[PDB]
Amino acid sequence: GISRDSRHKRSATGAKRAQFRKKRKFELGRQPANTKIGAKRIHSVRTRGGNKKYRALRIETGNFSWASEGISKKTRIAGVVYHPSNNELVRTNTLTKAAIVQIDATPFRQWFEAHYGQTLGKAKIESSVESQFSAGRLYACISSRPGQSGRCDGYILEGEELAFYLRRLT
Amino acid sequence: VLKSTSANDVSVYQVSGTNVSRSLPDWIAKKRKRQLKNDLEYQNRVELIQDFEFSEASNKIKVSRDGQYCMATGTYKPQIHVYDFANLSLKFDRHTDAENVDFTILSDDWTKSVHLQNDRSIQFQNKGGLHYTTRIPKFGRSLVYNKVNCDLYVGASGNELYRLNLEKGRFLNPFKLDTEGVNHVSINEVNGLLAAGTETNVVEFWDPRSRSRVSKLYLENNIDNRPFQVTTTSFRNDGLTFACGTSNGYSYIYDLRTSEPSIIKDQGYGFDIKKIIWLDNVGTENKIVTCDKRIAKIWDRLDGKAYASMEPSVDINDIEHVPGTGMFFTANESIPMHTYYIPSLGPSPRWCSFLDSITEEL
Amino acid sequence: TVQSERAFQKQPHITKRWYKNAGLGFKTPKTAIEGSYIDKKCPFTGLVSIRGKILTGTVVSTKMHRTIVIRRAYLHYIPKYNRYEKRHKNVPVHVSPAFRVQVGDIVTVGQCRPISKTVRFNVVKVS
Amino acid sequence: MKLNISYPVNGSQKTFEIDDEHRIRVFFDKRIGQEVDGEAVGDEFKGYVFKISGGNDKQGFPMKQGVLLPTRIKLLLTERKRKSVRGAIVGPDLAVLALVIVKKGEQELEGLT
Amino acid sequence: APHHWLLDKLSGCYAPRPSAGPHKLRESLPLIVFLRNRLKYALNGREVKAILMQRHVKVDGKVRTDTTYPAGFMDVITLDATNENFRLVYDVKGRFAVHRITDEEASYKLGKVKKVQLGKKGVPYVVTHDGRTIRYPDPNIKVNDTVKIDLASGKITDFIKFDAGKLVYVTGGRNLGRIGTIVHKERHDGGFDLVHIKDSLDNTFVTRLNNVFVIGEQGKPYISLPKG
RNA sequence: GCUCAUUAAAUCAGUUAUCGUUUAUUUGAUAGUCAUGGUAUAACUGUGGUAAU
RNA sequence: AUGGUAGGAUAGUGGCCUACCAUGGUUUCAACGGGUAACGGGGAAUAAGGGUUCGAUUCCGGAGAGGGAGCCUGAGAAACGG
């Protein structure tokens, strides 16, 4: 399918267009699955004989980590918010690496109450996140490759990195 | 065949999808394992049609006007599936570089095949393998060829509207966009007026013989929750009245008298209006299909009451219709492609000649 | 400005600044540790390993973004004529935001698991 | 056509050549799995209940379970090839009609029961 | 056919290819060349097979039954017949040399480490040139050093750090395979370190640091070099 | 394995670099967390169709 | 075309591909372009113990299995004994 043969494009000095050989198997390329948010379907690819890759195409749940307390809780996925490479992906709700999403705040909420003894801004954390706990939708980012591992794994926004993205969302 | 009531007292008949199970996708492994391990009387009751389990549903589904054909736009190892209703299997299975967002057939029975790729490009596709590939300035959502003017002109999320002629194979003097909402393209059959789906809910009527847009039509709502865009449009085969489908589920039904009033009719969910097709060919006419992401619905345009609510469990994104019949082609997000037929709409076609008999006698 | 791109720039961290030594007697500058540039392709504080050719030359053109051109002059010896020929080899290299480079700028680089289509060398020392 | 009749309760099986068109007409447009009384087909078949099971046509192409279309078509068959497939539904161009006895009636067949 | 096998060009067309194994294939000498061809123990190729299946030969403390089994530099090849022990050592002129050693010298071999890292669960490990990886070495043992190996177990009884002024054997390059005990270590572009060597006639010779194999101190080598 | 149509920093030759990678076989290291479960292919037994496999 | 960054794809590097961002690259030290009958050339490799420089061996480079195009297994093929 996709070929990565470096010959056809021009040289540094402008020499070009040899077609020394035809396209072969080791210079291969396969295709993106623009994964969405839905009932989780797992794809199968056989790569270089022994190994395999996980295309993702529909994702329901994924594992996100809360960075302040360092705990990890599996997250139900709702919607896509921001991505820097192309905003066509967000308006089609497509997951890639470094993609801003919205999540359910209630799995991180249930950890906060019975383990500590407090509610969520009706044990001190940031102000811009504590107002988002009442909204039920927390903002999170992706730090995995769904095109390779198939998982929706990532990190929730905190710190000055929170202030960078929320400036873009207004 | 299971018969399902849509609670409209109009019995809806379905096949080939979420309820039909093919226990022998591979007869070499499973059906040899079925003989000593089962009686297979339920599988003896299951009647598959045209022999495909086909993942990664499809971006679009098309049918030909002649030969009783189907196009299917697979995305697994992204591919194009062609079906013959005479032979009931794959005739032509080609794999594509990137996904075609919308497909357009040239005039009939896939003499050619025209794609609208995720890479900003059209692929020309013949009987032979992958005859020509193009490049487009912007990304693609929809495309329509017109037999008149020999032009296949495209546009999505662009500042200009891109006018390519297939005679002499060029593009020159392209049209422009008013504030870049061009999600959809639809053409009048009789008089050839262009339809457009805009973020500010405007339909742009560009006359190709005048090289210029005629008028704007705006949408207003009684509830009016959010700023909405019309995602897909349609023209009647008569060329009289207009179909407008917004993102909030509210069907807008317009008149080509250059006149603003409409009739409103919503789905219960209102997630989107996916595809709108006029039932002007089939008897008991003036009906029109309105489909959500999940809920599909056909209703009389002057009456506005539910004749059928066509609801598969897995969500879809596509409708395709065979004229004179109730043959409905939907791309449910699964391995089987749920197509389904309502006989109380109209008679079954000639390849479905026994397929009408199996359900009423049962 | 640090955060001028469309994505948030950060080190992967494989002070709020993580450092490492590229080795071979190339010292970590003040701009590396107490700086503001992220530069995942930088020899110090980044994700490249200097192994292979450590070469030197003269920087001749700097008008690109985050990269420069080394001109590598030398003399060829032709055995047939028993003469010399003056030569040069214009090599483009990635420069890091720790080294103050203009036309001139005697430079030292290191082979860095080729970065982009001609760049095999990243700037590690400028004199 | 011929009726390849099997009786699995005893396990025996026997074919009957049937040349009369009144006898075959009951089986027309019936499908594999359907319950068929041969008492209209024959007086010695009084009370019998038959299920259609399989068979072939006059060119060897078998009826496959529930495909459709009582003409012949070509299918992608099981590493998969394409051969010609005769449909699931009984037509007059069948050389045979193999079936199976479901409920037994009054009279008996010597070589069968 | 390569240089260092001492085969004639005669006696048959095809050269006996080496098997994959511990040593590099161009560095290897197969056992078919070792038995019937140089030591003249067998005559035909089939006669090598009868010796191996009866397990007469053992290489480096293992049974080692294979016709084209790759034997390389510094390999104790113990033959159970004759009570004689053989150690391969390269000859200056470009070729390999079969050498007699003692029973105590057949106990130990020397091995150049090629790469050292930290294994799983915090375990140091060194990787010899014969591919013998050993858990828990001395942290003094670092890159390009030799390792004395017990061969009853995989243990390390002696180790010699690379320092200038110690008796070095060369494994590779043009000037491959002499004494010369060190001049110093040069740095160059791309690495390409040229560890200089001055022989018994005190003449400078230049090969790569990759080719350097430390076979002893200034004065003493740890193994019985063949004298001639 | 045979046959048809001529490439100038390309091939090739050596050289690295693989801390940029994948590897069946080769070799060397390396794992404390019901006297017998449940399925399953056929061959075969006999009936046939098909100009034919 | 030169590069930046982000994503994708891949066994992996990577403008490989695409967004967005800068205007660069090689060059009288000859870039780039043209001619090559490139059966000419490679110590690739022994060779001829006086035939004066002879030999044989290996390497060319690419494509194909009626023509196009798409695919599947396998460490490896984009395999014509699918």
From Swiss-Prot, chain A:
Gene (name only): RPS8A
Signal sequence interval, chain numbering: none
Organism lineage string: Eukaryota, Fungi, Dikarya, Ascomycota, Saccharomycotina
Modified residues (Phosphothreonine): T61, T106
Domain of life: Eukaryota
Organism: Saccharomyces cerevisiae (strain ATCC 204508 / S288c) (Baker's yeast)
Transmembrane segments: none
Xref: Pfam families: Ribosomal_S8e
Name of the protein in its database record: Small ribosomal subunit protein eS8A
Function: Component of the ribosome, a large ribonucleoprotein complex responsible for the synthesis of proteins in the cell. The small ribosomal subunit (SSU) binds messenger RNAs (mRNAs) and translates the encoded message by selecting cognate aminoacyl-transfer RNA (tRNA) molecules. The large subunit (LSU) contains the ribosomal catalytic site termed the peptidyl transferase center (PTC), which catalyzes the formation of peptide bonds, thereby polymerizing the amino acids delivered by tRNAs into a polypeptide chain.
Keywords: Cytoplasm, Phosphoprotein, Ribonucleoprotein, Ribosomal protein
From Swiss-Prot, chain B:
Primary localization class, coarse: nucleus
Keyword Cell inner membrane: no
GO CC, any one term: nucleolus
UniProt keywords, alphabetically: Nucleus, Phosphoprotein, Repeat, Ribosome biogenesis, rRNA processing, WD repeat
Biological processes, Gene Ontology terms: maturation of SSU-rRNA from tricistronic rRNA transcript (SSU-rRNA, 5.8S rRNA, LSU-rRNA); ribosomal small subunit biogenesis
Cystine crosslinks: none
TM region(s), chain numbering: none
Localization per record: Nucleus, Nucleolus
WD repeat start-end pairs: 53-93, 177-216, 225-264, 268-309, 311-350
Family stated for the protein in its record: Belongs to the WD repeat NOL10/ENP2 family.
Its biological purpose: May be involved in rRNA-processing and ribosome biosynthesis.
Protein name: Ribosome biogenesis protein ENP2
Lineage: Eukaryota, Fungi, Dikarya, Ascomycota, Saccharomycotina
UniProtKB/Swiss-Prot annotation, chain C:
CDD domains per UniProt: Ribosomal_uS17 (cd00364)
Domain of life of the native organism: Eukaryota
PTM annotation: N-terminally acetylated by acetyltransferase NatA.
InterPro entries in the cross-refs: NA-bd_OB-fold, Ribosomal_uS17, Ribosomal_uS17_arc/euk, Ribosomal_uS17_CS, Ribosomal_uS17_N
Annotated localization: Cytoplasm
Note: There are 2 genes for uS17 in yeast.
Complex formation: Component of the small ribosomal subunit (SSU). Mature yeast ribosomes consist of a small (40S) and a large (60S) subunit. The 40S small subunit contains 1 molecule of ribosomal RNA (18S rRNA) and 33 different proteins (encoded by 57 genes). The large 60S subunit contains 3 rRNA molecules (25S, 5.8S and 5S rRNA) and 46 different proteins (encoded by 81 genes).
Name of the molecule in the record: Small ribosomal subunit protein uS17A
UniProt organism field: Saccharomyces cerevisiae (strain ATCC 204508 / S288c)
From Swiss-Prot, chain D:
Record-listed cross-link Glycyl lysine isopeptide (Lys-Gly) (interchain with G-Cter in ubiquitin), residues: K104
Localization per record: Cytoplasm; Nucleus, Nucleolus
Function summary: Component of the ribosome, a large ribonucleoprotein complex responsible for the synthesis of proteins in the cell. The small ribosomal subunit (SSU) binds messenger RNAs (mRNAs) and translates the encoded message by selecting cognate aminoacyl-transfer RNA (tRNA) molecules. The large subunit (LSU) contains the ribosomal catalytic site termed the peptidyl transferase center (PTC), which catalyzes the formation of peptide bonds, thereby polymerizing the amino acids delivered by tRNAs into a polypeptide chain.
Family from the record: Belongs to the eukaryotic ribosomal protein eS6 family.
Subunit and partners: Component of the small ribosomal subunit (SSU). Mature yeast ribosomes consist of a small (40S) and a large (60S) subunit. The 40S small subunit contains 1 molecule of ribosomal RNA (18S rRNA) and 33 different proteins (encoded by 57 genes). The large 60S subunit contains 3 rRNA molecules (25S, 5.8S and 5S rRNA) and 46 different proteins (encoded by 81 genes). Interacts with snoRNA U3. uS11 interacts with MPP10. Component of the ribosomal small subunit (SSU) processome composed of at least 40 protein subunits and snoRNA U3.
Other remarks on this protein: Present with 66000 molecules/cell in log phase SD medium. There are 2 genes for eS6 in yeast.
Name of the gene this protein is made from: RPS6A
